[PDB]
PDB file of C-alpha atoms in Angstrom:
ATOM      1  CA  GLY E   1      -0.034  -0.028  -0.119  1.00 22.67           C
ATOM      2  CA  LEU E   2       3.030   2.306   0.443  1.00 23.38           C
ATOM      3  CA  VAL E   3       3.668   5.117  -2.120  1.00 21.57           C
ATOM      4  CA  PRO E   4       7.228   4.417  -3.586  1.00 22.83           C
ATOM      5  CA  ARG E   5       9.793   6.642  -2.161  1.00 24.67           C
ATOM      6  CA  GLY E   6      10.998   7.433  -5.642  1.00 22.95           C
ATOM      7  CA  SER E   7       7.419   8.987  -6.628  1.00 22.50           C
ATOM      8  CA  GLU E   8       7.913  12.749  -7.448  1.00 25.67           C
ATOM      9  CA  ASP E   9       4.354  13.714  -8.494  1.00 26.19           C
ATOM     10  CA  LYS E  10       2.143  12.956  -5.575  1.00 28.56           C
ATOM     11  CA  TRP E  11       1.915  12.946  -1.752  1.00 28.09           C
ATOM     12  CA  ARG E  12       3.918   9.948  -0.560  1.00 26.48           C
ATOM     13  CA  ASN E  13       2.735  10.355   3.057  1.00 22.96           C
ATOM     14  CA  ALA E  14      -0.965   9.886   3.970  1.00 21.86           C
ATOM     15  CA  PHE E  15      -0.988  12.468   6.760  1.00 23.15           C
ATOM     16  CA  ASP E  16       0.576  14.973   4.434  1.00 25.61           C
ATOM     17  CA  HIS E  17      -2.419  14.479   1.983  1.00 24.77           C
ATOM     18  CA  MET E  18      -5.057  14.649   4.758  1.00 26.96           C
ATOM     19  CA  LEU E  19      -3.588  17.672   6.550  1.00 25.00           C
ATOM     20  CA  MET E  20      -3.005  19.610   3.332  1.00 22.07           C
ATOM     21  CA  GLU E  21      -6.434  19.065   2.102  1.00 18.62           C
ATOM     22  CA  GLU E  22      -7.954  20.320   5.385  1.00 18.08           C
ATOM     23  CA  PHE E  23      -5.541  23.333   5.261  1.00 17.62           C
ATOM     24  CA  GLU E  24      -6.525  24.229   1.809  1.00 16.14           C
ATOM     25  CA  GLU E  25     -10.211  24.302   2.809  1.00 17.80           C
ATOM     26  CA  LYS E  26      -9.489  26.376   5.758  1.00 20.03           C
ATOM     27  CA  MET E  27      -7.521  28.898   3.502  1.00 20.86           C
ATOM     28  CA  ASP E  28     -10.430  29.245   1.150  1.00 19.90           C
ATOM     29  CA  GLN E  29     -12.897  29.626   4.233  1.00 22.03           C
ATOM     30  CA  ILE E  30     -10.617  32.490   5.610  1.00 23.81           C
ATOM     31  CA  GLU E  31     -10.416  34.269   2.312  1.00 20.37           C
ATOM     32  CA  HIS E  32     -14.118  34.270   2.143  1.00 26.42           C
ATOM     33  CA  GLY E  33     -14.555  35.403   5.635  1.00 26.72           C
ATOM     34  CA  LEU E  34     -12.098  38.205   4.913  1.00 27.99           C
ATOM     35  CA  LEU E  35     -14.313  39.275   2.015  1.00 27.07           C
ATOM     36  CA  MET E  36     -17.475  39.104   4.251  1.00 29.02           C
ATOM     37  CA  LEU E  37     -15.406  41.234   6.864  1.00 26.66           C
ATOM     38  CA  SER E  38     -14.450  43.784   4.132  1.00 28.82           C
ATOM     39  CA  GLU E  39     -18.159  44.266   3.338  1.00 25.39           C
ATOM     40  CA  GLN E  40     -18.970  44.701   7.116  1.00 24.68           C
ATOM     41  CA  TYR E  41     -16.232  47.308   7.035  1.00 21.89           C
ATOM     42  CA  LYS E  42     -18.140  49.212   4.343  1.00 20.19           C
ATOM     43  CA  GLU E  43     -21.234  49.237   6.711  1.00 17.62           C
ATOM     44  CA  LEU E  44     -19.086  50.382   9.491  1.00 17.49           C
ATOM     45  CA  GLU E  45     -17.748  53.396   7.630  1.00 15.18           C
ATOM     46  CA  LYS E  46     -21.409  54.534   7.431  1.00 16.66           C
ATOM     47  CA  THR E  47     -22.791  53.636  10.828  1.00 19.41           C
ATOM     48  CA  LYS E  48     -19.802  54.023  12.871  1.00 18.14           C
ATOM     49  CA  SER E  49     -21.069  51.083  15.082  1.00 18.46           C
ATOM     50  CA  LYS E  50     -18.594  50.506  18.029  1.00 17.90           C
ATOM     51  CA  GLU E  51     -19.715  46.938  18.406  1.00 14.88           C
ATOM     52  CA  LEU E  52     -19.148  46.229  14.650  1.00 12.97           C
ATOM     53  CA  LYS E  53     -15.617  47.806  14.692  1.00 14.41           C
ATOM     54  CA  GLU E  54     -14.571  45.822  17.708  1.00 14.15           C
ATOM     55  CA  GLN E  55     -15.872  42.638  16.326  1.00 12.94           C
ATOM     56  CA  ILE E  56     -14.203  42.970  12.996  1.00 13.84           C
ATOM     57  CA  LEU E  57     -10.914  43.486  14.869  1.00 16.60           C
ATOM     58  CA  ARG E  58     -11.743  40.267  17.026  1.00 20.30           C
ATOM     59  CA  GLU E  59     -12.377  38.284  13.923  1.00 17.94           C
ATOM     60  CA  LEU E  60      -9.248  39.477  12.144  1.00 20.24           C
ATOM     61  CA  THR E  61      -7.183  38.668  15.253  1.00 20.63           C
ATOM     62  CA  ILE E  62      -8.535  35.000  15.353  1.00 23.22           C
ATOM     63  CA  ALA E  63      -7.770  34.647  11.659  1.00 22.20           C
ATOM     64  CA  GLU E  64      -4.245  35.998  12.137  1.00 18.83           C
ATOM     65  CA  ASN E  65      -3.541  33.748  15.078  1.00 20.07           C
ATOM     66  CA  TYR E  66      -4.632  30.651  13.208  1.00 20.09           C
ATOM     67  CA  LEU E  67      -2.526  31.574  10.057  1.00 18.51           C
ATOM     68  CA  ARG E  68       0.540  32.143  12.170  1.00 19.06           C
ATOM     69  CA  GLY E  69       0.244  28.643  13.618  1.00 21.27           C
ATOM     70  CA  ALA E  70      -0.298  27.141  10.014  1.00 22.81           C
ATOM     71  CA  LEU E  71       2.652  29.017   8.651  1.00 24.11           C
ATOM     72  CA  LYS E  72       4.830  27.398  11.375  1.00 23.86           C
ATOM     73  CA  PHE E  73       3.530  24.029  10.510  1.00 22.58           C
ATOM     74  CA  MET E  74       4.233  24.780   6.710  1.00 21.51           C
ATOM     75  CA  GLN E  75       7.788  26.183   7.267  1.00 22.67           C
ATOM     76  CA  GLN E  76       8.712  23.271   9.375  1.00 25.15           C
ATOM     77  CA  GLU E  77       7.506  20.695   6.692  1.00 24.62           C
ATOM     78  CA  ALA E  78       9.194  22.721   3.951  1.00 24.29           C
ATOM     79  CA  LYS E  79      12.603  22.154   5.794  1.00 23.30           C
ATOM     80  CA  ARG E  80      12.276  18.500   5.410  1.00 23.14           C
ATOM     81  CA  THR E  81      15.293  16.959   3.999  1.00 22.87           C
ATOM     82  CA  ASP E  82      13.300  14.282   2.171  1.00 20.84           C
ATOM     83  CA  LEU E  83      10.840  16.315   0.009  1.00 20.32           C
ATOM     84  CA  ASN E  84       9.694  15.281  -3.441  1.00 17.84           C
ATOM     85  CA  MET E  85       8.840  17.815  -6.207  1.00 19.18           C
ATOM     86  CA  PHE E  86       5.150  17.626  -5.600  1.00 19.26           C
ATOM     87  CA  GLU E  87       5.370  18.028  -1.739  1.00 20.52           C
ATOM     88  CA  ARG E  88       7.998  20.873  -2.020  1.00 22.84           C
ATOM     89  CA  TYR E  89       5.686  22.710  -4.458  1.00 23.42           C
ATOM     90  CA  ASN E  90       2.654  22.244  -2.240  1.00 26.56           C
ATOM     91  CA  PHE E  91       4.370  23.375   1.106  1.00 23.78           C
ATOM     92  CA  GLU E  92       6.055  26.326  -0.592  1.00 24.84           C
ATOM     93  CA  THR E  93       2.810  27.415  -2.202  1.00 24.51           C
ATOM     94  CA  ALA E  94       1.060  27.209   1.177  1.00 26.51           C
ATOM     95  CA  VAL E  95       3.695  29.338   2.765  1.00 25.43           C
ATOM     96  CA  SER E  96       3.176  31.874   0.008  1.00 25.48           C
ATOM     97  CA  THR E  97      -0.677  31.866   0.242  1.00 26.04           C
ATOM     98  CA  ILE E  98      -0.555  32.263   4.027  1.00 26.68           C
ATOM     99  CA  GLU E  99       1.956  35.159   3.966  1.00 28.84           C
ATOM    100  CA  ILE E 100      -0.393  36.949   1.361  1.00 24.98           C
ATOM    101  CA  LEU E 101      -3.492  36.345   3.446  1.00 24.90           C
ATOM    102  CA  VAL E 102      -1.852  37.631   6.555  1.00 23.45           C
ATOM    103  CA  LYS E 103      -1.059  40.804   4.731  1.00 20.81           C
ATOM    104  CA  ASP E 104      -4.626  41.235   3.561  1.00 22.61           C
ATOM    105  CA  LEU E 105      -5.897  40.678   6.952  1.00 24.10           C
ATOM    106  CA  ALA E 106      -3.459  43.432   8.368  1.00 25.99           C
ATOM    107  CA  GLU E 107      -4.566  45.878   5.688  1.00 21.82           C
ATOM    108  CA  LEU E 108      -8.330  45.392   6.598  1.00 22.24           C
ATOM    109  CA  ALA E 109      -7.515  45.797  10.170  1.00 17.82           C
ATOM    110  CA  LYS E 110      -5.779  49.209   9.523  1.00 18.37           C
ATOM    111  CA  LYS E 111      -8.881  50.486   7.521  1.00 22.33           C
ATOM    112  CA  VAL E 112     -11.065  49.391  10.356  1.00 20.77           C
ATOM    113  CA  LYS E 113      -9.050  51.021  13.002  1.00 21.27           C
ATOM    114  CA  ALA E 114      -9.103  54.225  10.916  1.00 21.15           C
ATOM    115  CA  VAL E 115     -12.920  54.527  11.234  1.00 24.22           C
ATOM    116  CA  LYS E 116     -13.350  57.234  13.838  1.00 25.41           C
ATOM    117  CA  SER E 117     -15.990  55.586  16.147  1.00 26.14           C
TER     118      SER E 117
ATOM    119  CA  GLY H   1     -26.153  39.759  13.178  1.00 23.90           C
ATOM    120  CA  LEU H   2     -23.381  39.971  15.677  1.00 26.52           C
ATOM    121  CA  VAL H   3     -23.845  37.629  18.647  1.00 24.82           C
ATOM    122  CA  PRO H   4     -24.204  39.523  21.811  1.00 22.73           C
ATOM    123  CA  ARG H   5     -21.032  39.708  23.874  1.00 23.14           C
ATOM    124  CA  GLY H   6     -23.091  38.507  26.829  1.00 18.37           C
ATOM    125  CA  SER H   7     -24.091  35.351  25.275  1.00 19.44           C
ATOM    126  CA  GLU H   8     -22.616  32.317  27.357  1.00 19.31           C
ATOM    127  CA  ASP H   9     -23.889  29.397  25.290  1.00 23.11           C
ATOM    128  CA  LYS H  10     -22.274  29.623  21.932  1.00 24.07           C
ATOM    129  CA  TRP H  11     -19.347  30.895  19.937  1.00 23.84           C
ATOM    130  CA  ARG H  12     -19.588  34.712  19.856  1.00 20.13           C
ATOM    131  CA  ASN H  13     -16.880  34.852  17.132  1.00 21.37           C
ATOM    132  CA  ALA H  14     -17.566  33.563  13.544  1.00 22.20           C
ATOM    133  CA  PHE H  15     -13.894  32.580  13.001  1.00 22.80           C
ATOM    134  CA  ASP H  16     -14.081  30.537  16.242  1.00 25.43           C
ATOM    135  CA  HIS H  17     -17.103  28.800  15.046  1.00 27.67           C
ATOM    136  CA  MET H  18     -15.428  28.280  11.559  1.00 27.90           C
ATOM    137  CA  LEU H  19     -12.316  26.878  12.988  1.00 28.10           C
ATOM    138  CA  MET H  20     -13.818  24.821  15.798  1.00 28.20           C
ATOM    139  CA  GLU H  21     -17.188  23.623  14.768  1.00 30.66           C
ATOM    140  CA  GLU H  22     -15.866  20.303  13.348  1.00 30.68           C
ATOM    141  CA  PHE H  23     -13.001  20.031  15.508  1.00 32.08           C
ATOM    142  CA  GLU H  24     -13.716  16.859  17.439  1.00 34.39           C
ATOM    143  CA  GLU H  25     -14.671  15.194  14.139  1.00 36.43           C
ATOM    144  CA  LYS H  26     -11.289  16.139  12.657  1.00 37.02           C
ATOM    145  CA  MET H  27      -9.531  14.770  15.662  1.00 40.60           C
ATOM    146  CA  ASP H  28     -11.424  11.586  15.187  1.00 40.42           C
ATOM    147  CA  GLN H  29     -10.007  11.351  11.748  1.00 39.42           C
ATOM    148  CA  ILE H  30      -6.488  11.628  13.159  1.00 42.43           C
ATOM    149  CA  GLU H  31      -7.315   8.975  15.859  1.00 43.85           C
ATOM    150  CA  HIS H  32      -8.484   6.789  12.936  1.00 40.90           C
ATOM    151  CA  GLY H  33      -5.205   7.422  11.052  1.00 38.60           C
ATOM    152  CA  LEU H  34      -3.447   6.414  14.184  1.00 38.58           C
ATOM    153  CA  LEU H  35      -5.607   3.132  14.411  1.00 37.40           C
ATOM    154  CA  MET H  36      -4.636   2.324  10.744  1.00 40.04           C
ATOM    155  CA  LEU H  37      -0.930   2.749  11.682  1.00 39.25           C
ATOM    156  CA  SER H  38      -1.426   0.524  14.859  1.00 38.58           C
ATOM    157  CA  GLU H  39      -2.701  -2.216  12.560  1.00 34.12           C
ATOM    158  CA  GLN H  40       0.137  -1.714  10.134  1.00 34.03           C
ATOM    159  CA  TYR H  41       2.483  -2.073  13.275  1.00 30.97           C
ATOM    160  CA  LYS H  42       0.943  -5.558  13.879  1.00 37.46           C
ATOM    161  CA  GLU H  43       1.915  -6.585  10.326  1.00 36.68           C
ATOM    162  CA  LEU H  44       5.306  -4.992  10.825  1.00 37.25           C
ATOM    163  CA  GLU H  45       6.009  -7.300  13.857  1.00 37.30           C
ATOM    164  CA  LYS H  46       5.643 -10.130  11.586  1.00 39.51           C
ATOM    165  CA  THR H  47       7.269  -9.122   8.365  1.00 37.75           C
ATOM    166  CA  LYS H  48      10.014  -6.745   9.838  1.00 36.84           C
ATOM    167  CA  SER H  49       9.646  -4.768   6.751  1.00 37.70           C
ATOM    168  CA  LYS H  50      12.241  -1.852   6.830  1.00 38.09           C
ATOM    169  CA  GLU H  51       9.992   0.182   4.507  1.00 36.46           C
ATOM    170  CA  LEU H  52       6.765  -0.362   6.559  1.00 33.92           C
ATOM    171  CA  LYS H  53       8.673   0.517   9.640  1.00 32.06           C
ATOM    172  CA  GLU H  54      10.122   3.811   8.249  1.00 37.11           C
ATOM    173  CA  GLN H  55       6.823   4.840   6.658  1.00 37.04           C
ATOM    174  CA  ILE H  56       4.866   4.354   9.814  1.00 37.53           C
ATOM    175  CA  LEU H  57       7.506   6.470  11.560  1.00 35.94           C
ATOM    176  CA  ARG H  58       7.215   9.213   8.831  1.00 32.86           C
ATOM    177  CA  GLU H  59       3.418   9.398   9.264  1.00 33.08           C
ATOM    178  CA  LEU H  60       3.748   9.566  12.962  1.00 36.58           C
ATOM    179  CA  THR H  61       6.318  12.349  12.780  1.00 37.38           C
ATOM    180  CA  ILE H  62       4.042  14.449  10.603  1.00 37.23           C
ATOM    181  CA  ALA H  63       1.068  13.824  12.904  1.00 38.26           C
ATOM    182  CA  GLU H  64       3.153  14.692  15.914  1.00 36.41           C
ATOM    183  CA  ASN H  65       4.340  18.009  14.534  1.00 38.78           C
ATOM    184  CA  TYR H  66       0.718  18.871  13.671  1.00 37.82           C
ATOM    185  CA  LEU H  67      -0.622  17.943  17.080  1.00 36.57           C
ATOM    186  CA  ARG H  68       2.223  19.548  19.063  1.00 36.94           C
ATOM    187  CA  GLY H  69       1.307  22.806  17.172  1.00 39.44           C
ATOM    188  CA  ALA H  70      -2.562  22.315  17.571  1.00 39.56           C
ATOM    189  CA  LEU H  71      -1.843  21.744  21.298  1.00 42.75           C
ATOM    190  CA  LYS H  72       0.050  24.953  21.792  1.00 39.58           C
ATOM    191  CA  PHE H  73      -2.608  26.927  19.889  1.00 36.57           C
ATOM    192  CA  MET H  74      -5.511  25.481  21.950  1.00 33.92           C
ATOM    193  CA  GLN H  75      -3.573  26.132  25.272  1.00 32.39           C
ATOM    194  CA  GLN H  76      -3.198  29.758  24.204  1.00 31.70           C
ATOM    195  CA  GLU H  77      -6.926  30.083  23.262  1.00 30.72           C
ATOM    196  CA  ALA H  78      -7.883  28.714  26.673  1.00 31.10           C
ATOM    197  CA  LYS H  79      -5.787  31.679  28.227  1.00 31.49           C
ATOM    198  CA  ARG H  80      -8.025  34.371  26.465  1.00 33.15           C
ATOM    199  CA  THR H  81      -9.141  36.981  28.996  1.00 33.27           C
ATOM    200  CA  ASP H  82     -12.587  37.155  27.436  1.00 30.94           C
ATOM    201  CA  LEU H  83     -13.913  33.755  27.289  1.00 32.83           C
ATOM    202  CA  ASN H  84     -17.623  32.841  27.682  1.00 32.61           C
ATOM    203  CA  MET H  85     -18.715  29.424  29.358  1.00 31.08           C
ATOM    204  CA  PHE H  86     -19.033  27.575  26.176  1.00 32.14           C
ATOM    205  CA  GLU H  87     -16.049  28.943  24.432  1.00 32.75           C
ATOM    206  CA  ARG H  88     -13.785  28.100  27.543  1.00 32.32           C
ATOM    207  CA  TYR H  89     -15.353  24.610  27.853  1.00 33.22           C
ATOM    208  CA  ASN H  90     -14.573  23.791  24.081  1.00 34.76           C
ATOM    209  CA  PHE H  91     -11.005  25.000  24.191  1.00 32.25           C
ATOM    210  CA  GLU H  92     -10.222  23.141  27.262  1.00 34.47           C
ATOM    211  CA  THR H  93     -11.824  19.979  25.912  1.00 35.13           C
ATOM    212  CA  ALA H  94      -9.870  20.498  22.802  1.00 33.24           C
ATOM    213  CA  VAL H  95      -6.530  20.704  24.837  1.00 33.27           C
ATOM    214  CA  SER H  96      -7.562  17.240  26.520  1.00 30.37           C
ATOM    215  CA  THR H  97      -8.445  15.578  23.280  1.00 28.82           C
ATOM    216  CA  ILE H  98      -5.193  16.601  21.580  1.00 27.20           C
ATOM    217  CA  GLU H  99      -3.189  15.532  24.653  1.00 27.76           C
ATOM    218  CA  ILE H 100      -4.621  12.029  24.475  1.00 30.58           C
ATOM    219  CA  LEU H 101      -3.707  11.670  20.783  1.00 29.03           C
ATOM    220  CA  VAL H 102      -0.180  12.991  21.430  1.00 27.91           C
ATOM    221  CA  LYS H 103       0.260  10.333  24.193  1.00 27.39           C
ATOM    222  CA  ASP H 104      -1.165   7.512  21.936  1.00 28.78           C
ATOM    223  CA  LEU H 105       1.066   8.545  18.980  1.00 27.70           C
ATOM    224  CA  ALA H 106       4.344   8.631  21.230  1.00 28.93           C
ATOM    225  CA  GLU H 107       3.456   5.074  22.531  1.00 29.95           C
ATOM    226  CA  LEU H 108       3.103   3.634  19.030  1.00 30.23           C
ATOM    227  CA  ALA H 109       6.184   5.364  17.741  1.00 31.42           C
ATOM    228  CA  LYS H 110       8.176   3.615  20.739  1.00 32.29           C
ATOM    229  CA  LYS H 111       6.756   0.068  19.628  1.00 30.71           C
ATOM    230  CA  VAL H 112       7.472   0.743  16.044  1.00 31.92           C
ATOM    231  CA  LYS H 113      11.100   1.947  16.549  1.00 30.57           C
ATOM    232  CA  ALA H 114      11.742  -1.155  18.628  1.00 33.08           C
ATOM    233  CA  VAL H 115      11.071  -3.490  15.717  1.00 32.63           C
ATOM    234  CA  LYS H 116      14.348  -4.853  14.987  1.00 32.95           C
ATOM    235  CA  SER H 117      14.383  -4.543  11.096  1.00 31.66           C
TER     236      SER H 117
END
């Protein structure tokens, strides 16, 4: 049942496949949540709701914390000495995708904090 | 739309709900992977397959790295200064659930390493 170690084009390890599939799903969910928070931000510019402002900031903090933990996992697996082409590509891509999303979150946080409430 | 901050019986934060709503189910899937590896270990005791031994160890190394990180994360969430009754219970329970899996993984790793291959 074992994937040959010489395979270059697929996940050789079952836990890599499982965990990376769940990570990818979470990144899609976070990107969508950020889009929803951006739209709440648009409402906040008009209403100046203190509760909405504080809540968006809480959400952004939660997402950031999660992504920082994910990033540590990805960077650590990316330092593996035994990495095939497919695995290296998937881990390096994940690192890139997270680092971008962390930036997008921090940018929304800045806009939200700028709302005089 | 926002959950009142005084609510005690649910996730107040959407990103907490997103991250945690299927948590215990996801951990069940890790537990199941550990079961499959335990059963492979029983085959290994008979065959003494070097490849099977190494592959079980690789899988447990990946799961260990994931869980050590998830544990540290959940322990920090349980230190939040604003936690309601439900949020605290769920974070604390998650810490316990992860601790159990970490212990089971370390025990299996020890038995697998001992197979003289």
